[PDB]
Design a protein around this ligand. Sequence first.
Ligand SMILES: *[C@@H]1O[C@H](CO)[C@@H](O)[C@H](O)[C@H]1NC(C)=O
Lengths: 50, 50
Amino acid sequence: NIAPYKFKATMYYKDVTVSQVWFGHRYSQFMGIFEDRAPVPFEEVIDKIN
Amino acid sequence: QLSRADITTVSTFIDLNITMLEDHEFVPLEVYTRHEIKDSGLLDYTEVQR
Ligand SMILES: *[C@@H]1O[C@H](CO)[C@@H](O)[C@H](O)[C@H]1NC(C)=O
């Protein structure tokens, strides 16, 4: 048997994204963007999502 | 007058039975199809990137 064991699963995460913006006299620019996948706790996955 | 089959007959010939080789049909057979081999990998860069 070479076929990998396949099973269904559900992912839970929050795309935390905090960006730094510089406002010029006539333009806007992104001085930095930080993207992170924050996990969801068991309490929220059970008592809030499910 | 008597029929030809009324007298006992003995075969003076040395019989040789010849059984021709029966036709055989070969069906396709593969241990692992190309799809199975591709699926053997745990991860696929194409699907993951898509
Ligand atoms: C086949 O050969 C045998 C001898 O080996 C003979 O006795 C027989 O009559 C032949 N034919 C058949 C239909 O068996």
